[PDB]
Design a binder for this molecule. Structure first.
Ligand SMILES: *[C@@H]1O[C@H](CO)[C@@H](O[C@@H]2O[C@H](CO)[C@@H](O)[C@H](O)[C@H]2NC(C)=O)[C@H](O)[C@H]1NC(C)=O
Ligand SMILES: *[C@@H]1O[C@H](CO)[C@@H](O[C@@H]2O[C@H](CO)[C@@H](O)[C@H](O)[C@H]2NC(C)=O)[C@H](O)[C@H]1NC(C)=O
Ligand SMILES: *[C@@H]1O[C@H](CO)[C@@H](O)[C@H](O)[C@H]1NC(C)=O
Ligand SMILES: *[C@@H]1O[C@H](CO)[C@@H](O)[C@H](O)[C@H]1NC(C)=O
Ligand SMILES: *[C@@H]1O[C@H](CO)[C@@H](O)[C@H](O)[C@H]1NC(C)=O
Ligand SMILES: *[C@@H]1O[C@H](CO)[C@@H](O)[C@H](O)[C@H]1NC(C)=O
Ligand SMILES: *[C@@H]1O[C@H](CO)[C@@H](O)[C@H](O)[C@H]1NC(C)=O
Ligand SMILES: *[C@@H]1O[C@H](CO)[C@@H](O)[C@H](O)[C@H]1NC(C)=O
Ligand SMILES: *[C@@H]1O[C@H](CO)[C@@H](O)[C@H](O)[C@H]1NC(C)=O
Lengths: 120, 361, 99, 254, 50, 49
């Protein structure tokens, strides 16, 4: 909050603008990375209510209805196992929406194989 | 946004244009409770004062000295301070205070000063030229004068050489003004050094008795501990104020704290060595220091070809500290929140997106 | 240590932020690291020099932090591009690529 | 008044292990659930701490150096240890510090005391004997406070003199160990800060005789010396230092 | 004078570390490519052209 | 070996720690690169005589 310090800081030019622009580029790049990795399907696929897959069990990777976060048991375990002018911007995609994208990908690859990745 | 982007046409999107700072509103200056007053009652309100020759010296240490009580009194005739001003006495701090007390005449008060001359300065009480302190004198014809004559106050009338500063001479040896030895008898050319002032109530104002207290303030290389009392501005909570607690200053919101400090601990630090907890010196309570809200100010707009309507996002700022909607990203002003879900047009954050159809979020 | 790769990124980012905050406590050759102390103790001709020393030290710290942030951003971008490639080729199809 | 004690028994002073004792709070700042690295005048872990006894006939009042700071440990029962003497020459030439804890209160005085060769207090079987100094001419600082104080009580004190500030740190510990220092950790709370502003290079322990000649009550004390070093302190959720690491002791702690 | 020497040498060391990190990123990318070639060309037959 | 230079260098903070940490990260990264490229088999195969 020092006015004299800011007045002396203005003598150095646009260093602050460069640093803010670089941090902004990194911040938008993280969201772009999340879009590139997880948002590869424009259809939110869902599994059938009856889990008859010829003996194959996907309960550990499909979302758990009992959990409020709608995560898989594996994803829930993964989330449990990871623990002065600075601000932290929230990610554009929240964890439940990323989990929803993974659920859509899992439903597509279980019910349709590789067909959903190449078309209908 | 046009100013930041250096263009008169703004493409559709969100642009971080400025920053918001919750500006500080008040100043809270809390220092410790006023206790341990310095014994000024035993100097000024003494039942009897000493003579100018055997002047009483009281050393005052390790207490709180309130000088405004003396300065605002109407009972003192002289309050002449040399080397320091009376207004900053109640602020400054000194290692020791020397209170010299004696009784002199009315016309002899002017001689209690640096660089003066007279019987009192040369033979009774000498002040240094480099003197820092105050000379306080008041009339005491009521107490120190009786109708028969009060002969209890004396002054040294002679001596071979002048006194050094802050010297006391209580010797009762016969002054030798001549070549002949006195041999202890007050004969020819041999007089007695101490002479009384026959203080009578009917005297003139230049001959009436005056009680003089000289306070000497010195700074030595030891840490100064006799400090004048500081005040305590009424504590204000839940607002961004500038706090000064026992010399630790800063800006923050002071809220109630659940942290139980140990009795010897006063301030609190986190991992990053920033003061986030503090103890109030007046009332022993723990206060959390939350930093004042700061945030990026972003402008959400469609193209200027389409419309000139904008919305403002204050990032990480609650809506009560700034078509107002509260998001996890921050406070969004100018966008109408709807319950429908669409594709993301302008990204806001935390799953929130904005679009133009008015501006909706 | 199964999830060390994500925890490494979290630790690196938190450590970089902690170092950047910690660098404010350094005076960088000035009499004090606190701006208020310099502004209250010295006249503006020498306080300008002390503030200038603090400004150049803090600016060097911030530029350094931005530089490693950009390098780590490049590394994370490469990892994300690899992850997107694995999502496209392993999940959305069957890959003949060995390992 | 001074009295020579001529009934002592000759014995060399002992030495023992410091273990993890002598840690004090370096500042007045609350810290919770954190690990803080601080560089200050500390007592090294597992160091050689000098051991002195008071038993009957041992009465250990030697002349010890002060150096950068002094850690004073006391395995005490029945209140024999009463105070300390600090100074450079311990006479009227220089200015010396007196700390005493008699039957009523704790007195700190900074005066030019002409100290006795064997300064002591006495208990008659009531306290009626005090022979520490013969004179006190120029006194600058006085401070009267509350009483600070099988072996049942452990007294730890840390005396430091930096920048004209005398820091006294204290901790009182209930123990039931018979002869040596118990092995454990206890952080010393700051007790008092004194603006004495004097040069200190030598110090003396003040004991109390028991009279019924004289008899020395059963007591034992330990003297250790502080060195400038770094410790890693652990602060729990309640702000109390519960463990410490000496950064220069061994490569594991390093 | 020592302060001038310190700031010059510190700037030189920071510059050296900066290009070392950039070259480390380049070498890491090359090593990842080499590991991919080892997995796909040596440990199997690759249908990828060139 | 200058003590005065090191005392003045301590005023700048943890720059030296940052540089050492970055170099250590590069140094371990090189070994990780060599492991990733060459150590892809856990059996040491040998040709027939
Ligand atoms: C698929 O696998 C899950 C998990 O292994 C099975 O769920 C278990 O069912 C048994 C019997 O009801 C329970 O005792 C276990 O506690 C269940 N495990 C969990 C993690 O819930 C499930 O039965 C399997 N089969 C189907 C058809 O879903
Ligand atoms: C107690 O013993 C000490 C040590 O002998 C005496 O101190 C000596 O006093 C004589 C006085 O004539 C000096 O000449 C010596 O140099 C002193 N020695 C030391 C080591 O200080 C002390 O006087 C004795 N106490 C009494 C009351 O006699
Ligand atoms: C001394 O006496 C006067 C007159 O009674 C009184 O106003 C004052 O409070 C007393 N104390 C001091 C410290 O002046
Ligand atoms: C401070 O003084 C106030 C009255 O002015 C009193 O209520 C409070 O208990 C005091 N606090 C301490 C710590 O003495
Ligand atoms: C402590 O010092 C004495 C001599 O001063 C020595 O004999 C003894 O072995 C030392 N103790 C340790 C544990 O080093
Ligand atoms: C303790 O010492 C103080 C200061 O010398 C004295 O006033 C007090 O009477 C002493 N008490 C006893 C029991 O000797
Ligand atoms: C200390 O005491 C001696 C003798 O009483 C005296 O001559 C000397 O001036 C005193 N010094 C101070 C600083 O009071
Ligand atoms: C303190 O005393 C010792 C020995 O008497 C002397 O070597 C040292 O220079 C003195 N220090 C000061 C600051 O007077
Ligand atoms: C901290 O204090 C709480 C009571 O407030 C107590 O239950 C807890 O055990 C304490 N923790 C430690 C480590 O002593």
């Amino acid at each position: 909050d020092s006015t004299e310090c800011s007045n002396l800081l203005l003598q150095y030019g646009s260093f602050c603008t460069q640093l803010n622009r670089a941090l902004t580029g990194i911040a938008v790049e993280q969201d772009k990375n999340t879009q590139e990795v997880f948002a590869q399907v424009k259809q939110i696929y869902k599994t059938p209510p009856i889990k008859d897959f010829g003996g194959f069990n996907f309960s550990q990777i499909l979302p758990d209805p009992s959990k409020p976060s709608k995560r898989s048991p594996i994803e829930d375990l993964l989330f449990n196992k990871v623990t002065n002018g600075l601000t932290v911007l929230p990610p554009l995609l929240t964890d439940e929406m990323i989990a929803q994208y993974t659920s859509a990908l899992l439903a597509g690859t279980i019910t349709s194989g590789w067909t959903f990745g190449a078309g209908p | 946004t046009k100013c930041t982007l250096k263009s008169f046409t703004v493409e559709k999107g969100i642009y971080q244009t400025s920053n918001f700072r919750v500006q500080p509103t008040e100043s809270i200056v809390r220092f410790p409770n006023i206790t341990n007053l310095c014994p000024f009652g035993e100097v000024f309100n003494a039942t009897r004062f000493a003579s100018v020759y055997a002047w009483n010296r009281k050393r005052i240490s390790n207490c709180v000295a309130d000088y405004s009580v003396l300065y605002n009194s109407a009972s003192f005739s002289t309050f002449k301070c040399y080397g320091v001003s009376p207004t900053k006495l109640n602020d400054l701090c000194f290692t020791n205070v020397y209170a010299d007390s004696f009784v002199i005449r009315g016309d002899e008060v002017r001689q209690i000063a640096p660089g003066q001359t007279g019987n009192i300065a040369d033979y009774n009480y000498k002040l240094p030229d480099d003197f820092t302190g105050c000379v306080i004198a008041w009339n005491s014809n009521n107490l120190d004068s009786k109708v028969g004559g009060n002969y209890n106050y004396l002054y040294r009338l002679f001596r071979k050489s002048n006194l050094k500063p802050f010297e006391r001479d209580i010797s009762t040896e016969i002054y030798q003004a001549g070549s002949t030895p006195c041999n202890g008898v007050k004969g020819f050319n041999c007089y007695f050094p101490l002479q009384s002032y026959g203080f009578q109530p009917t005297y003139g104002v230049g001959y009436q008795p005056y009680r003089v207290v000289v306070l000497s303030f010195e700074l030595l290389h030891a840490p100064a501990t006799v400090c004048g009392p500081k005040k305590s501005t009424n504590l204000v909570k839940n607002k961004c104020v500038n706090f000064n607690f026992n010399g630790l200053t800063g800006t923050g919101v002071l809220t109630e704290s659940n942290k139980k400090f140990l009795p010897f601990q006063q301030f609190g630090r986190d991992i990053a060595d920033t003061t986030d907890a503090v103890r109030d010196p007046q009332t022993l309570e723990i206060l959390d220091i939350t930093p004042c809200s700061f945030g990026g100010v972003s402008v959400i707009t469609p193209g200027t070809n389409t419309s000139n309507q904008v919305a403002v996002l204050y990032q990480g700022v609650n809506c009560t500290e700034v078509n107002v909607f509260q998001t996890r990203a921050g406070c969004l002003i100018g966008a109408e929140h709807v319950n429908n879900s669409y594709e993301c047009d302008i990204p806001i954050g935390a799953g929130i997106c904005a679009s133009y159809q008015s501006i909706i979020a | 240590s199964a999830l060390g790769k994500l925890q490494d990124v979290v630790n690196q980012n938190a450590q970089a932020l902690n170092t950047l905050v910690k660098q404010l406590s350094s005076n960088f050759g000035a009499i004090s690291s606190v701006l208020n102390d310099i502004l209250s103790r010295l006249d503006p001709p020498e306080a300008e020099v002390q503030i200038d020393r603090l400004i150049t030290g803090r600016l060097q710290s911030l530029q350094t932090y931005v530089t490693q942030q950009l390098i780590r951003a490049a590394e994370i971008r490469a990892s994300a591009n690899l992850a997107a490639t694995k999502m496209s080729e392993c999940v959305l199809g069957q890959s003949k690529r060995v390992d | 008044q001074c009295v020579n004690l001529t009934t002592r028994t000759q014995l060399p002073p002992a030495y023992t292990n410091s273990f993890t004792r002598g840690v004090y709070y370096p500042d007045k700042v609350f810290r919770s659930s954190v690990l803080h690295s601080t560089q200050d005048l500390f007592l090294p872990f597992f160091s050689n701490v000098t051991w002195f006894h008071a038993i009957h006939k041992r009465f250990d009042n030697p002349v010890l150096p002060f150096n950068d700071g002094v850690y004073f440990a006391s395995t005490e029962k029945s209140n024999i240890i009463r105070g300390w003497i600090f100074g450079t020459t311990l006479d009227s030439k220089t200015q010396s510090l007196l700390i005493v804890n008699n039957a009523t209160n704790v007195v700190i005085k900074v005066c030019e005391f002409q100290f006795c060769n064997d300064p002591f207090l006495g208990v008659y079987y009531m306290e009626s004997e005090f022979r520490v100094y013969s004179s006190a001419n120029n006194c600058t600082f006085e401070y009267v406070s509350q009483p600070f104080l099988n072996f049942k009580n452990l007294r730890e004190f840390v005396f430091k003199n930096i920048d004209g500030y005398f820091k006294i740190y204290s901790k009182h510990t209930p123990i039931n160990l018979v002869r040596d220092l118990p092995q454990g950790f206890s952080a010393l709370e700051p007790l008092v800060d004194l603006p004495i502003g004097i040069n200190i290079t030598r110090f003396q322990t003040l004991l109390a005789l028991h009279r019924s000649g004289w008899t020395a009550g059963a007591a034992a004390y330990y003297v250790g010396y502080l060195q400038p070093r770094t410790f890693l302190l652990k602060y729990n959720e309640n702000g109390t230092i519960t463990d410490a690491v000496d950064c220069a002791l061994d490569p594991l702690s390093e």
